């Protein structure tokens, strides 16, 4: 005759809509088709998507060096980078393809001025951001703790992806349409 039930917070566990790595697979698919849409190929998408990690590797550091956790705040400043790194990577692969499709180069002479052209900009953005997200990173005191959590993960996931796409995003581009054009 004795029973039980869950209330309060323990009611809001067994419901919440539909998880995360499921709504991030539908993001994966949707990012792909967009690049495919732009670049006119199934192959060139894998050039800019293979960025993604370059930023989170630094985010999951500092977030592991300072006490910080996998907050809401962590992720927001982790989608801001996972997006920004892809952006300026869409801009090397852009130049690269067009400085070649509508220029006439290739192999390396494509990836050539591309990665060269897209540098003076990037180093601006990432330093426009960092210095300016700086203060947030060690915050005074009033409502600090939430600022620190935004900060010590964007900055730390930015410098990690600034000089990481700068050398690595040229490579994907190469043995990605070198590899994906039939081998």
């Amino acid at each position: 005759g004795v029973g039980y039930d869950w209330t309060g917070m323990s009611y809001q566990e067994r419901l919440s809509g539909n998880q995360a790595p499921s709504l991030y697979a539908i993001s994966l698919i949707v990012v792909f088709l967009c690049l495919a849409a732009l670049y006119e190929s199934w192959s060139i998408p894998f050039s800019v998507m293979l960025v993604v990690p370059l930023g989170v590797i630094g985010a999951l550091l500092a977030a592991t060096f300072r006490g910080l956790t996998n907050d809401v705040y962590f992720q927001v400043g982790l989608l801001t980078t996972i997006g920004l790194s892809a952006k300026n990577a869409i801009l090397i692969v852009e130049f690269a393809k067009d400085l070649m499709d509508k220029e006439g180069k290739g192999l390396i002479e494509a990836t050539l001025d591309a990665v060269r052209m897209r540098l003076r900009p990037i180093l601006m953005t990432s330093l426009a951001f960092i210095l300016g997200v700086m203060p947030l990173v060690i915050s005074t005191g009033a409502g600090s703790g939430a600022q620190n959590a935004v900060g010590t993960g964007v900055m730390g996931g930015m410098v990690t992806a600034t000089v990481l796409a700068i050398f690595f995003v040229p490579v994907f581009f190469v043995v990605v349409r070198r590899r994906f054009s039939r081998k």
Binding site: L50, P53, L54, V56, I57, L60, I108, T111, V115, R116, L119, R120, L164, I166, F167, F168, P170, V171, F172, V174, V175
Partner: protein, 40 residues
Amino acid sequence: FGWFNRMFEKSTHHYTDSVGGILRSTGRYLVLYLIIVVGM
């Protein structure tokens, strides 16, 4: 300037050259990135 303005992008060509050292000898460099994936 000649030591302050040009000073800046004077690391672009040295950088441009670091792409003159990409997958040039044999086929092995897409292994360092794959360490960074398992790095997360």
